[PDB]
Amino acid sequence: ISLHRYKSTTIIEFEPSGTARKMVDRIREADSVESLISRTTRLVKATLGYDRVLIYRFEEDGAGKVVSEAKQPELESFLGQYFPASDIPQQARALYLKNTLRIISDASGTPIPVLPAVDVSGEPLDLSYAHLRNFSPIHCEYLRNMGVAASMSISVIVDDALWGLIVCHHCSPRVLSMPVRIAAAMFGEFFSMFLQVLKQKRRLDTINHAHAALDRFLRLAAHRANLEELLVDSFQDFARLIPCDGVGLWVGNNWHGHGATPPHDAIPRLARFVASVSEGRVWATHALSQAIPEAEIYA
Amino acid sequence: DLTNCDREPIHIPGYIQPHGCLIACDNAMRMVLRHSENCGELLGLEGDLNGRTAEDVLGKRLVHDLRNALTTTRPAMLPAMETSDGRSFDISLHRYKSTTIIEFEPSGTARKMVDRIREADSVESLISRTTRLVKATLGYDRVLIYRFEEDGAGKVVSEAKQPELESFLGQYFPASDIPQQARALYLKNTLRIISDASGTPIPVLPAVDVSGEPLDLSYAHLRNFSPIHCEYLRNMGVAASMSISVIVDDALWGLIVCHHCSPRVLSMPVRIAAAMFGEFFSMFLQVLKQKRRLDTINHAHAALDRFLRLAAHRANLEELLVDSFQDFARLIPCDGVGLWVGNNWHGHGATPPHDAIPRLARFVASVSEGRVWATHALSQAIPEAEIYADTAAGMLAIPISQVKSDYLLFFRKEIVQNLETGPMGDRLTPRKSFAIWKESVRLQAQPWSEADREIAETARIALVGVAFHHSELMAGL
Amino acid sequence: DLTNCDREPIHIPGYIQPHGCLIACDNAMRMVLRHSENCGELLGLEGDLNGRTAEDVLGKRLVHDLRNALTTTRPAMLPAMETSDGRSFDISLHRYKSTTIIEFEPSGTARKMVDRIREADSVESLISRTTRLVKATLGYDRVLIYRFEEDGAGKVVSEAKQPELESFLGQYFPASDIPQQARALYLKNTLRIISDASGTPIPVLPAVDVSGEPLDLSYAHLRNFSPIHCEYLRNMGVAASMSISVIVDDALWGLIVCHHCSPRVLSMPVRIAAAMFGEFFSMFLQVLKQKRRLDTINHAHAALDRFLRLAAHRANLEELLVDSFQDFARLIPCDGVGLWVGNNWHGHGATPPHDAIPRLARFVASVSEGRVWATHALSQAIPEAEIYADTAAGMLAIPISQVKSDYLLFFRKEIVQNLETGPMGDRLTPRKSFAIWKESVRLQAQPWSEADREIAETARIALVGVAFHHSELMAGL
Ligand SMILES: *C/C=C1/C(=C/C2=NC(=C\c3[nH]c(/C=C4\NC(=O)C(C=C)=C4C)c(C)c3CCC(=O)O)/C(CCC(=O)O)=C2C)NC(=O)[C@H]1C
Ligand SMILES: *C/C=C1/C(=C/C2=NC(=C\c3[nH]c(/C=C4\NC(=O)C(C=C)=C4C)c(C)c3CCC(=O)O)/C(CCC(=O)O)=C2C)NC(=O)[C@H]1C
Ligand SMILES: *C/C=C1/C(=C/C2=NC(=C\c3[nH]c(/C=C4\NC(=O)C(C=C)=C4C)c(C)c3CCC(=O)O)/C(CCC(=O)O)=C2C)NC(=O)[C@H]1C
Ligand SMILES: [Cl-]
Ligand SMILES: [Cl-]
Ligand SMILES: [Cl-]
């Protein structure tokens, strides 16, 4: 029996009837985000027995990326693929901030009406926290089209926000019993915590590395009479500071480029543009043709 | 009024300081719309300037050069400009809300100054040397750095002064002493001068134009300051001042504040050098704060690792915590720390009395919800904590078990333990401000910073994780 | 008497505590020379024991085993020994000044205790956990660690106590409160017990033998303590105590001191475990002090290198010092630092007033002789410094030029700012001791340690060397 209160209605759900610790021991020593997420799909699949287990990470715009996968050999791979923000709608992502573990037992099953659906005073039954809640028929149809009959997902919560989901698919109907769900929720909470710390350590390492690289350049500047020449000789090394595919230097109205940059003759227009919006601050875009229409050609 | 401080509209006083004159023109600079009453005197003109053309008043040569200097709302600085008469002025020119404002002053510093701060390797080293350096360079009798606390209260964090003057170092003043609207202005104009706090101000004619609009002097360096502040200064024996806004991560971190005991103006070239210095000072401070925070987080991560390394060689994690918990005081600045485990308390340093702990622990258990929970005003949460405020007025609580209500508790002492008049009255003195501040922070401790809270959360995860890993050894016990 | 404290001959009181009995024999243990008055009672004997043979009194079996246990003057511990009667005792046996002393008590602890301190990684972590651990293990109402200052004054540096008892933490007491001869005894006997501070002591018969010699009880655990100390304890509400000598680098660093508010004896097995613990505690503390000193010196060397690296990129070493000198506060713990160069002063933190500096600098120039010069009692050197003692009561001066009388000056505040009766009177209370100490250190600061002085000398060489290297650039200026 699962029992809760929400909006002052009581909801009782009935299912006719060291896992977590052992699982968490197998991820606690991960020392990078990639090591954590790679091993987790493999581990969740072995433990819970789902045909496919994915980790789906939210981009900043809400689009999702499949960042890890473990699957039966005959099933297709979704690894490295992205899906639109709309595929997991806004209200779905809000629900998943409340209920951290969700089950669909049978995507082709026949759902069971709540009697009455609307009470005498005009209120529906809010099933936000009910594990027996029936899912959108849009999503259920999405699953059937994939050959998926059942699923389970765990919300991954990092710094109080929805970072992503652990998503399990089965090609035949499947329910997790309450003790198994409890163990898996517990696992998901530790996974979330460890991921959060690993992301934070990665960011620190990244900032520390950048500070040391700046110091190395400044140490060279202190032995050179001509700082401009030094920059012309050295600027490619600034690609180490920030992940990029190209970098260049615009100094004294002359350009020097390295890696993937706009064509040489498109630079003066770009530099005029930068001069007009920078205002002496860092200025950045991921959609350059929205700023400069002519940049579409070298996108 | 002295209570509704943040209401005074200081951007539209209707007056300028006497060390220059001002002309207001339309957007295109064709007609004179307003002028300060002293324009005739300084420019050698007569009668009502308003309604005459810019060219009639200033001549075609000067008006031509001024139009060409226009091209956000950052004032153009034009030294040694001449009127048709031959009189020479330093001219500041800007546009705001589509009115043009022309200010007239009858008339490698920055690089050398910045070289003397660029190698500072700590925030304290930067701020200490800067007051000393600004005083030597600009010659003000007193130079202070005033840092804003998170609630807006100010703290004097560095000082250089004539030996006979009183020290304000380590003192705090209420948020209201530099009102909200003042702090907003200082986000726009980064350098401000008061030439003579006892001088006679000069009206702008007209103060309100025909359509009911005042002249917005937000960006005008000749803007006259609030008479409340000017009276505050006279009570201190201060006749002139200059302040530089310190901007860190796009916000007002504080001020460099210079006081002189006699009247004093900085010429335009000197103001320009000092603004430039202030911008480099701001940038360097920002980087130094960021490096300090990194060092702090890195240190905390290494300390957690050292503890976890010990946990991996111990059969009994609870005993280890009982023996080790005092070392967690290294993670976060505090005056005391303690451990609540298996319904037993162990304390170190300044903590509530032993017998007040179970009430505190019940409280923590009811609000934590398995997260870090912190306050700098413990008596607001638990009325009975007022009695032990002198020892522990702030608390931060870290859950250390996913399953049990065990916690590591950090404490801080109440903050008070780590430390002429004019017609408007004695409110306007540093002594009264400081007393008002002290009264405002009674029963309160220094707030837990964002860094403190980030460290706590990292610690929570470390400790909750190792507890879970040891959970069957401990149930075996 | 309460003034000539160090005269009382506490090694020869002529009395033992009532929780055991004592027999004194000759070197070979053939004859009884002395006995405590309670021997008849505890051993089941009658009359004058002196003159009877060890075998007549104790039986041949026991005397045989005692001879065999003899083999510096560290007492042999023989638990559960039986007399011919069948009465069972824990026996402590030793020889000193060729008298044999037999003490009778009617009758993995250490390893487990030591495991709980062995991983301490700082002096503060070691001492904090030890009071807590000793209290839990041995059950005394209060356990303190009392550390000797260089002048012999004591400081309570750690404490664990019943909640209702008063705290002594952070308090200091005069050197005289643990006299010279007491500290010498505690260098020999490392563990001491007082069972009952209100008990009735037991005379040794005879107290002086026929040839005029007292019985030297230096190594006897039943030795009765000075009535001055026993009265001090009763005034505190303390009925029993135990102390362990803490020996670091062959000297008495301090004491672990346990107080009980009711009578209390530790059995021989418990004393043995606690002595063993104390020896490991001493060893670990010694290593931790040594590591701390190394870390401190290493840190200072790296800070000097950072400054020298800056000097190598600057054309004007004096300007660099004027901008940087506050950073030298990192080298040596201080409350203020300043720079006297070219007959001009620059200060930071708590320093003498600006106008008192030239007198101070003349003084330094006359005693330095090109070496580090330091005092913790500045008014003894310069009478006029008494007035600013609250801000600067100690000074350490580092020459920074081989040729000119330029100095870097470190300062410390006066120490007071960083903080029932029986027939013999109110002198014998912690309140009075603490007040006496406070009075004794007026106008004085915390002494400059050997580490401080080693760092200063290294700094002198660094600064004098870089000054010489820059000397022709600076004369060019
Ligand atoms: C116009 C609406 C659409 C839509 C809505 C929708 N999706 C929901 C849940 C949901 N979608 C996904 C997406 C995927 N799962 C996959 O395995 C893959 C593989 C490529 C994709 C793209 C997930 C993971 C989930 C959550 C699953 C879970 O178990 O929590 C929901 C909410 C369903 C609910 O009742 O909670 C909605 C309303 N999806 C669409 O594609 C469109 C068109
Ligand atoms: C009810 C209103 C009050 C008030 C208003 C006020 N203060 C303003 C400027 C201002 N205040 C300070 C405070 C100090 N300066 C000091 O040196 C000390 C020393 C102890 C204190 C407390 C500063 C630094 C400034 C800014 C100075 C500058 O040059 O920029 C202003 C704005 C003035 C303006 O026209 O810009 C206002 C309206 N001060 C009060 O004390 C109360 C009562
Ligand atoms: C003029 C003589 C005085 C004097 C003499 C004295 N003290 C001795 C032992 C001793 N003193 C202390 C001091 C304290 N213990 C405390 O708990 C506190 C608390 C504030 C204080 C100040 C200690 C720890 C000891 C040693 C205790 C132990 O168990 O070893 C002795 C020697 C006693 C002996 O026979 O060994 C002497 C002679 N104390 C005075 O206060 C003055 C006046
Ligand atoms: Cl990520
Ligand atoms: Cl800061
Ligand atoms: Cl020490």
Residue numbers in the entry:
A (entry chain A): 103 to 119, 127 to 408
B (entry chain A), C (entry chain A): 9 to 79, 84 to 119, 127 to 438, 449 to 506
Structure paper excerpt:
Phytochromes are biliproteins of plants, bacteria and fungi that use red light as a source of information to regulate fundamental physiological processes, such as photosynthesis, seed germination, flowering and shade avoidance. The conjugate Meta-F and Pfr crystal structures has been obtained from the engineered photoactivatable near-IR fluorescent protein (Agp2-PAiRFP2), derived from the bathy phytochrome Agp2 from Agrobacterium fabrum.
Here we describe the crystal structure of a Meta-F intermediate of the PCM of a bathy phytochrome at 2.16 Å resolution formed during the Pfr→Pr phototransformation. The intermediate has been generated by irradiating crystals of the parent Pfr state at ambient temperature and identified as Meta-F by resonance Raman (RR) spectroscopy. Compared to the Pfr structure, the overall fold of the protein and specifically the α-helical segment of the tongue remained unchanged but significant structural changes were observed for the chromophore and its binding pocket as reflected by the ΔFo (FoMeta-F−FoPfr) electron density maps. The C-D methine bridge has undergone the expected E→Z isomerization as also shown by 2mFo-DFc and several types of omit electron density maps. The resulting ZZZssa stereochemistry of the chromophore structure exhibits a deviation of the tilt angle between neighbouring C and D pyrrole rings (38.9° and 44.5° for Mol A and Mol B, respectively). In the structure of the Meta-F sub-states of Mol A and Mol B, these Pr characteristic features including the concomitant re-positioning of Trp440 away from the sterically pressing Gln190 were not visible. Instead, the amino acid segments 439–448 in Mol A and 439–442 in Mol B were not resolved in the electron density map, indicating a disordering of the polypeptide backbone.
